[model samples]
Target: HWGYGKHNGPEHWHKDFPIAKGERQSPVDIDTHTAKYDPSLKPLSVSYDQATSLRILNNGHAFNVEFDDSQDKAVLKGGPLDGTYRLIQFHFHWGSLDGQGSEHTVDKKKYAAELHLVHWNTKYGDFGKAVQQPDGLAVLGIFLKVGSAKPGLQKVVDVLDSIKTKGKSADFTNFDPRGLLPESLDYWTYPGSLTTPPLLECVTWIVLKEPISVSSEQVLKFRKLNFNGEGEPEELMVDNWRPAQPLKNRQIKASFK
Candidate 1:
């Protein structure tokens, strides 16, 4: 089982998935001062119906809030994207502690956690097919800082108790993903890959600069999840974030100065 373990960690991922060493890898450091302010970048347009969320699942990686992308029930547009993108699923990456788990760092500083809302473009048909192409995905990264308990996230955290083990799934609906966002939609955009393997170079990453608040206790609760399935040795699901990759020659664009 390839995972974040010492033996099968990210450094050894290229052994199975060659794209781990690809040019457009994800989770790069966002230096706000150096990012180019592009006036042409449109304001993000989001439309998420409460009922679009189908369920929550622990796929041995992260607790993902799955959506019914059968229709254009929930969609993202305008920000760094040419076409409409459907929200297929959203998940989190965190650490064992509150200060070091986010995948993308800002000015070389790590946050308590990072949230990824994964979407696939409509032109690509489905998430399965869209993942293979270069312009198929658009992942919105939201940084989570430790502070007040995030009332909006209570719904997702409430179900974490039930999906504490790997491969666990529970029915969850009517949770609006928009409620979890910060006040400002100001963001930094870049070309990147999936933080995990097969590490396809397709994502148009729109990382919000404003961080949402989560209490220290709430952040610790995510650690209670077990990476190993039932009957296997217990592995607490923490520190599941990938290290930052090289920025290469790509320019980081900002929606706001």
Candidate 2:
């Protein structure tokens, strides 16, 4: 019921979830010029196995590629994190047309789309328990620009047709997640919340400075998905992103000078 709509979209979410206006909220604009390079921040370490991915599904929000979090086969470490964080799932936020789509913007400039890699602290036990703590979650935000075809994204994009409606899912395994990353790992780090509902203020946001490329044609495939379920009146799922929140008294740090 909280899916993006004219009457029930992001503007109305604050009514049901008051934390939408919280101080630590996410998807804040990164003013590249002002992002201070912090020497204490270390380079990010990522170790992912192809067999870790299990399936893909439209959780009524975005098409998430679920991973086997039972073990630490894939993990994100360092780079503003205090301990090892397991990659639980990864999803994307995009727009219906050009000129917009990404959740986090640089200098208020929107990218074609944004990819979020969701992770939880291993010390906290499970994602359920981790979500309760402020330092329990960490997310990597990668921006997507339209130009050439991205081979890494093609594997997931090919299966979009199979799950065109909400609640739809398909067996998707052995996908190489590292292939989706940009050449540069430099990023801006901040203390923020999830860009979606419940809007929990429990995430350490690490948004990459470099962007991975994708084709406009490839993005159209994502739009084919429906917010409504299989038998309901069809509504294409697009623009499932939240606007930038106030920085309050937050300071964004950078990994590179």
| Candidate 2 least-lDDT 10 residues | 42-51
Candidate 1 C-alpha lDDT tens digits along 30-124: 98789999988887887776338989999998899999999888888997899899999999999988879999999999999999999899998
lDDT by residue (1-257, candidate 2, tens digit) is: 68688889889999999999888998899998888999999879877763389999988888999999998889999999999999989999999985789989999999989999999999999998888999989999999999998999999999999988889999988888998899988999999998898899889999999999999889989888888889899888899988888999999999998
Provide the lDDT at 230 for model 1: 84
Model 2: per-residue Cα lDDT at residue 130: 88
RMSD of 2: 0.9
Clashes (N, CA, C under 3 Å) per candidate? 0, 0
RMSD of each: 1.0, 0.9
TM-score per candidate: 0.98, 0.98
Displacement of residue 242 (Cα, Å) in model 2 is 0.4
Candidate 1 worst ten-residue window by lDDT: 42-51
Position 189, candidate 2: lDDT: 98
Clashing pairs in 1: none
Badly placed stretches (over 4 Å) of model 2 are: none
